[PDB]
């Protein structure tokens, strides 16, 4: 008869544990997925930062190509006008 009380206590603790473990479960599944999500975004961030670095270098090449063009035009003009003045 103390055993009705034993089995009742056992019953309520079993309910409590089962319930709680269900909570633990949803926390673990969501935490696993979130972690995967974070690795994916990490990798994507890496690819795009690489691409941006590459483009920054290209901008520097194009900028240099442009100043080279300006100096070449200035000199060419000076030449054309010197030959115009000579003739």
């Amino acid at each position: 008869g103390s055993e009705f009380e034993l089995r009742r206590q056992a019953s309520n603790y079993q309910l409590t544990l089962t319930n709680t473990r269900a909570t633990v479960n949803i926390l673990m599944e969501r935490l696993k997925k979130s972690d995967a999500d974070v690795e994916q975004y990490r990798a994507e961030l890496e690819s795009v930062q690489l691409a941006k670095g590459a483009l920054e270098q290209s901008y520097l090449v194009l900028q240099a190509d442009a100043e080279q063009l300006r100096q070449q035009l200035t000199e060419s003009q000076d030449a054309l006008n010197a030959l115009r003045s000579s003739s």
Partner: protein, 71 residues
């Protein structure tokens, strides 16, 4: 209103046990999540899911009330 959440709080004020809600936004997950803790004996850690924090809170509250009645 009159809600699940209100019934549980009525019950916690009435029976002097603490109840704490913790809400998790949908984020990149399939739904909202709420964990609710009950400082009962034995203590309970229940949860609820929903399409809103309101819904997940009521789902949690409900979970909590079902467990309390089953003890």
């Amino acid at each position: 209103p009159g809600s699940m959440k209100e019934q549980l709080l009525y019950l916690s004020k009435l029976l002097d046990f603490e109840v704490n809600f913790s809400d998790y936004p949908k984020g990149n997950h399939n739904e909202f999540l709420t964990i609710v803790t009950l400082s009962t004996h034995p203590p309970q850690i229940c949860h609820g899911v929903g399409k809103s924090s309101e819904e997940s809170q009521n789902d949690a509250a409900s979970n909590a009330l079902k467990i309390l009645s089953k003890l």
